[PDB]
Amino acid sequence: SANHLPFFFGNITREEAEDYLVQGGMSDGLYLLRQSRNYLGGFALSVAHGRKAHHYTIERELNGTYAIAGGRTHASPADLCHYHSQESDGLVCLLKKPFNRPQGVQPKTGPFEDLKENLIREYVKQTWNLQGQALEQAIISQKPQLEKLIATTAHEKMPWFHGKISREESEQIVLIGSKTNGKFLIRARDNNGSYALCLLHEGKVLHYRIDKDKTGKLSIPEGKKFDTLWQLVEHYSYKADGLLRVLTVPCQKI
């Protein structure tokens, strides 16, 4: 939980960051650390080199260690920063100055980092039927792993996710009601393997295929790659990044 690092901006957009750096000075070696949005618990390191910006994904190593694939694995991101602060090591450049969270600004919280923290507290009281003070423990105790669970399967509860469904059973359910554009939903075209994305575009229903690659990473063919969909969505519902448009509203389930 990198929140102590003054150059850490919770869930921020790649662009949102790119701004901060100019707002920063785009001075070579300027960097800031932001939480990743398509890799569980990993991060992203953004740095200014030559009026251009370079984005690096610090993935989380099963060992509890973090490392941008290809390089050494460090204790914590701060270390990794401290480290790259004196050794290029594959990096476009050294990290001279860090861009600190401007006066007042706080780290961005996703729209579920908030949900989750409770989502499970729930799961727990439920499956484990305990409460009072018993509950408090279980979570802090168990927490560490639970996250990886609730996550990969939270979409199961999300409005845009409509269980297992026919290609048409979809067409229809989305055409029904308000034909506001960018209305979407995801249906599994197979239990856990791969799913599918449907959205409304100029009264037209659009189906984009989604699949889990070798790595257990979902990604529209030729598209960004996410751990979870909760992530996937949250992203495309922000920038088309390929789609004929962006997602808006979660078609309603019957």
């Binding site: 984005h55 390089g71 063919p221 990044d241 390929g242």
Partner: peptide, 18 residues
Amino acid sequence: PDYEPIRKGQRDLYSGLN
């Protein structure tokens, strides 16, 4: 029967090491 394809050219990709 038919899935909509993308426009790859407009992809925010991530810089790598080396």
